[PDB]
Design a protein around this ligand. Structure first.
Ligand SMILES: *[C@@H]1O[C@H](CO)[C@@H](O[C@H]2O[C@H](CO)[C@@H](O)[C@H](O)[C@H]2NC(C)=O)[C@H](O)[C@H]1NC(C)=O
Ligand SMILES: *[C@@H]1O[C@H](CO)[C@@H](O)[C@H](O)[C@H]1NC(C)=O
Ligand SMILES: *[C@@H]1O[C@H](CO)[C@@H](O)[C@H](O)[C@H]1NC(C)=O
Ligand SMILES: *[C@@H]1O[C@H](CO)[C@@H](O)[C@H](O)[C@H]1NC(C)=O
Length: 462
């Protein structure tokens, strides 16, 4: 089969109450089942529209407020899928596994692949020298059930966010795929998307067609809003990408979508309501990709578009960029930091007097809430008129662009092209990436621009 219908669900989770000691197994199961009641509504609705697969979010059934002990009662022992097991048809093969059982039956009864995120426990003895003092491993765990209810994938999250003290890191990164009649699938979770293992390996070495991606992502503008970065990673890696996110505006969680190599196909962003949201779209089972992009090609072939720049320092997500202000309604600028030079040609649709845009370059190691090496060229709207706010989180803008073209001398082939419009809207079909590494407009932007950015990772320098 050449196409399929993908579904993702953004979930307004029912969170356990704050308490002082762990709840009982029974209480934990009752809460998880309240969340599974809502997810069932989304799963059935998707199947009722012909979806072949649905993704649900990270932490969707029990939330994220835990220590090791308060989490324990929510956990089950999830077997390796090689055991060949359909929980719905063979309950009790592995003791008490009611969550796995209900997920299996949801997939089977609605004849749909179901991707979900739950918690694994693996009891161990002191005979095992890595066994934690308290007698078990606890893992953040994606599970996939096929349309017969069979367990076909289990993935323990490799790259834990700071504050995920309730979980362990696996001994070695787990490279997890599953094959279907509508393509080869890979899987990883939230923060994993910023790292090499397993995310990059799945694409490079295992040639997956599609990624399924449960997440509970906290939006950080200008470069790491969920719909923005997730759609860019898909475009840069040339895969289909099903992003299912938590809905919790209180912690800046919102941003789900279905992304293809050429463009976003559907997205949802909502900071105002507490509603969940189901998105569907057709995708190609084996997406065609253009020619491989050389990200330094055009940029290394030209001379600086400007010189005698008035340059200044600005902070973007704790990293010190080198910026130059855009003075004209139209222009051509070049700005550099260390090994990276960034080039921008642009024309605004009109100059908004009290609105300032800057071009920035960064080439260095990020360290706050994670350690990773970045190379970034960014056009962005500065939060205020003051240049000290270029790089700050900016939600809205009024300046539309008639044209833009951005490029840089990247020392990596892993670069993710981002375009975000005012109110955190994507710009599907409005831009393109050339083989020589230019990100450029195909027409005037449909709304005002917050950023156009080339976000690059040098995994070897982490
Ligand atoms: C410098 O920027 C200008 C725009 O401010 C670039 O010219 C553009 O304008 C034309 C209007 O008809 C477009 O048709 C051109 O395609 C467009 N240029 C590009 C490269 O897209 C100008 O070329 C820039 N200078 C360069 C790239 O050297
Ligand atoms: C939290 O407490 C409120 C108020 O008693 C109750 O209505 C709700 O069901 C509780 N949630 C859980 C998970 O116990
Ligand atoms: C699966 O289908 C049968 C319908 O008779 C029912 O016994 C079972 O409860 C269903 N489970 C789910 C989760 O839909
Ligand atoms: C990319 O282009 C640059 C300069 O145009 C060239 O030096 C380099 O060899 C190219 N690399 C690849 C992988 O094509």
């Amino acid at each position: 089969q050449d196409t399929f219908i993908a579904a993702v669900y953004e979930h307004a989770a029912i969170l356990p109450n704050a308490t002082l000691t762990p709840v009982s197994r029974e209480e934990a199961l009752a809460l998880m089942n309240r969340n599974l009641d809502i997810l069932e509504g989304a799963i059935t609705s998707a199947a009722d529209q012909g979806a072949h697969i649905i993704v649900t979010p990270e932490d969707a059934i029990y939330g994220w407020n835990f220590n090791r002990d308060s989490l324990y009662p929510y956990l089950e022992d999830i077997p390796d899928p090689e055991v060949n097991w359909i929980p719905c048809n063979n309950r009790n093969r592995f003791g008490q596994t009611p969550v796995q059982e209900r997920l299996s039956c949801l997939a089977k009864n609605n004849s749909i692949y179901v991707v979900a995120n739950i918690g694994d426990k693996k009891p161990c003895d002191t005979s095992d020298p890595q066994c934690p003092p308290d007698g078990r491993y606890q893992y953040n765990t994606d599970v996939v059930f096929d349309s017969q209810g069979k367990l076909v994938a289990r993935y323990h999250k490799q790259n834990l966010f700071m504050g995920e003290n309730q979980f362990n890191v696996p001994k070695e990164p787990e490279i997890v795929t599953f094959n279907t009649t509508f393509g080869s699938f890979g899987i990883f979770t939230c923060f994993d998307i910023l790292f090499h293992d397993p995310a990059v390996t799945l694409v490079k070495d295992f040639h997956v067609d599609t990624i399924v991606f449960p997440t509970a992502w906290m939006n950080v503008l200008p470069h790491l809003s969920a719909v923005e970065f997730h759609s860019a990673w898909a475009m840069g890696m040339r895969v289909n990408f099903l992003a299912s996110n938590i809905h919790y505006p209180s912690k800046k969680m919102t941003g789900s979508g279905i992304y293809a190599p050429n463009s976003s196909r559907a997205f949802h962003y909502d900071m105002k309501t507490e509603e969940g949201k189901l998105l569907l779209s057709q995708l190609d089972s084996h997406p065609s990709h253009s020619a491989v992009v050389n990200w330094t090609s055009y940029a290394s072939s030209i001379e600086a578009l400007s010189s005698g720049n008035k340059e200044f320092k600005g902070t973007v997500f704790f990293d010190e960029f080198t910026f130059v202000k855009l003075t004209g309604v139209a222009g051509n600028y070049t700005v550099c930091q260390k090994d990276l030079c960034c080039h921008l040609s642009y024309k605004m649709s009109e100059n908004i007097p009290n609105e300032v845009y800057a071009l920035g370059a960064f080439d260095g190691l990020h360290t706050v809430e994670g350690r990773y090496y970045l190379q970034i060229c960014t056009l962005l709207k500065c939060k205020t008129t003051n240049l000290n706010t270029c790089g700050d989180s900016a939600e809205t803008a009024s300046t539309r662009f008639e044209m833009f073209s951005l490029s840089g001398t990247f020392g990596t082939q892993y670069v993710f092209p981002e375009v975000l419009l005012s109110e955190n809207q994507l710009a599907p079909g409005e831009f393109q990436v050339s083989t020589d590494g230019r990100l450029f407009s195909l027409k005037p932007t449909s709304g005002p621009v917050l950023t156009v950015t080339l976000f690059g990772r040098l995994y070897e320098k982490d």
